[PDB]
Design an enzyme around this catalytic site. Structure first.
Site, PDB file in Angstrom:
ATOM      1  CG  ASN A   1      -3.063 114.820  57.498  1.00 12.50           C
ATOM      2  OD1 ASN A   1      -2.315 115.160  56.568  1.00 12.50           O
ATOM      3  ND2 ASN A   1      -4.384 114.772  57.381  1.00 12.50           N
TER       4      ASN A   1
ATOM      5  CG  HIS B   1       0.861 111.813  61.001  1.00 13.60           C
ATOM      6  ND1 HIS B   1       1.379 110.537  61.195  1.00 13.60           N
ATOM      7  CD2 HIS B   1      -0.413 111.697  60.554  1.00 13.60           C
ATOM      8  CE1 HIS B   1       0.413 109.694  60.846  1.00 13.60           C
ATOM      9  NE2 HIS B   1      -0.687 110.346  60.467  1.00 13.60           N
TER      10      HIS B   1
ATOM     11  CB  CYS C   1       8.197 110.688  67.236  1.00 13.05           C
ATOM     12  SG  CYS C   1       7.604 111.096  68.900  1.00 13.05           S
TER      13      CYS C   1
END
Ligand SMILES: CC1=NN(c2ccccc2)C(=O)C1
Ligand SMILES: CC1=NN(c2ccccc2)C(=O)C1
Ligand SMILES: CC1=NN(c2ccccc2)C(=O)C1
Ligand SMILES: CC1=NN(c2ccccc2)C(=O)C1
Lengths: 268, 269
Positions: A190, A192, A227
């Site tokens: 995804n 991330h 982050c």
């Protein structure tokens, strides 16, 4: 891998790979954490939940809801060596309206002995607004039939290390590793940052002398914020003592906290 | 995993893991490269050579000699999806006194179809001085009985991409990713940067638009120097071209010393 006889937990075996080991010829804690993620993902697939790390129901997907890690606690007694077969058993349990818990037990395949254990706390969040919410009765009843009814805990001892509150590291830090950035290998499907990259970033500020003379026994990490793919992180560490350390990960610019944690190391 | 019937090659199966896949829900080229490394290590163990990635003999160890990668060439037709089983077959061949070659064939376990292939050139080097040396007849004879005698090549084609010379990227680069540093997860058991980290660093300077609209088909990478645990790297890329081709350079951030050069070919999704 497969669901166990009663269908309330999942087991999977792994053979430790050549690139998965550190300087001691044994699996790193990040290799262990990725294996915990893999067995969790296969457990979710086996009973029909999403396989993207969020273990969602169709009800959660329509109300853009996901499960996100709030705390990860790992205790390793023996790191498996290259070529060793490790068996991991995982299960979940609901914790009222607060969230859910996923536990793991790591065993050596040949001896049957427990070589490690882990527990993680998960909270429900809207994937777009990042706003947390208490678990509803309907999005709790869906999970009940896939979890043990009586408590089953990887860390049963009253007042154990997995539930201790973690304080905020005060400046100046004793040690630091500044300007840490994720690359594409650190991202998930995804896009991330993978939860395990944060464990690596925490460990980056431990001096090489400690890594060379000690073995990591326990790591407890609290997750507060992500982050982003284009953010830069500073990793800070201070000795609180066996050797114990307090850790803080913050964004390089504004100093915004992304994680806090503690590590316990025993002399080799 | 196991040595094949004739004992001259090694096969191993792998089930693609959840954290090993990219945005397409298929294995990344770095996951593929780590699997090539793993099957090579298991082949070396199966016949008695070292298992540290250097595949040394007892003669090589007393002389402080190791095999090091000079070039890695990977061509993928289909990246395996999460949960897919991929079978990889590997073998080595001596290439006179120049060095040795390790080849790989990747197949889908269910269909039996070849989904990828790879070839790598290795040179012998003293571990301490970093000085290369031609292979002696006594070292070459110890490996002969573990390799096919007749040529067996993963890339037989007459003017194949694995043997093309790579030029040096000229400044200014079209794209760049600056200040790349390895973390402990990038190191191997000997505390050296893993060969696959350099592939990742090369790919860091490809714009996200290309990654989103294209799939990596071919990557050829030349290894010249190591990035030390405390070095910082700059990754540079310039388009050389449906298919999109790029020229790549990895250099140390300070002095601009070359560590790698390569080429990548991408086809539209
Ligand atoms: C309670 C919860 N159980 N689970 C769960 C996930 C996968 C398999 C079985 C159960 C959650 O995600 C929350
Ligand atoms: C609780 C929260 N956990 N997280 C989080 C952040 C990064 C990775 C995994 C989880 C939040 O953003 C808030
Ligand atoms: C020729 C060479 N063969 N090999 C080799 C390595 C492992 C298994 C079988 C063969 C080299 O390292 C060089
Ligand atoms: C030929 C050479 N290959 N290399 C090399 C560097 C990094 C990783 C793997 C290999 C040299 O230093 C010289």
């Amino acid at each position: 891998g497969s669901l166990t006889e009663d269908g309330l937990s999942y087991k999977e075996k792994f053979v430790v790979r050549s690139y998965e080991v550190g300087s001691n010829k044994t699996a790193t804690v990040e290799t262990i954490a990725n294996l915990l993620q893999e067995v969790g993902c296969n457990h979710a697939q086996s009973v029909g939940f999403s396989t993207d790390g969020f273990a969602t129901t169709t009800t959660m997907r329509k109300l853009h809801l996901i499960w996100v890690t709030a705390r990860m606690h790992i205790e390793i007694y023996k790191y498996p060596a290259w070529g060793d077969v490790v068996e991991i058993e995982t299960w979940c349990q609901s914790e009222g309206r607060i969230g859910t818990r996923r536990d793991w037990i790591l065993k050596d395949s040949v001896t049957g002995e427990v070589t490690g254990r882990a527990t993680s706390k998960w909270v429900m969040m809207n994937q777009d607004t990042r706003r947390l919410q208490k678990v509803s009765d309907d999005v709790r009843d869906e999970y009940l039939v896939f979890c043990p009814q009586e408590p089953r805990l990887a860390f049963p001892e009253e007042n154990n290390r997995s539930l201790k509150k973690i304080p905020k590291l005060e400046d100046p830090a004793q040690y630091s590793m500044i300007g840490l950035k994720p690359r594409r290998a650190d991202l998930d499907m995804n896009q991330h940052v993978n939860n395990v990259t944060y464990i690596g970033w925490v460990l980056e500020s431990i001096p090489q002398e400690i890594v060379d003379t000690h073995e990591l026994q326990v790591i407890t990490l609290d997750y507060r914020r992500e982050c982003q793919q284009d953010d830069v992180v500073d990793s800070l560490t201070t000795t609180t003592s066996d050797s114990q350390f307090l850790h803080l990960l913050r964004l390089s610019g504004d100093g915004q906290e992304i994680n806090r944690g503690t590590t316990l190391w025993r002399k080799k």
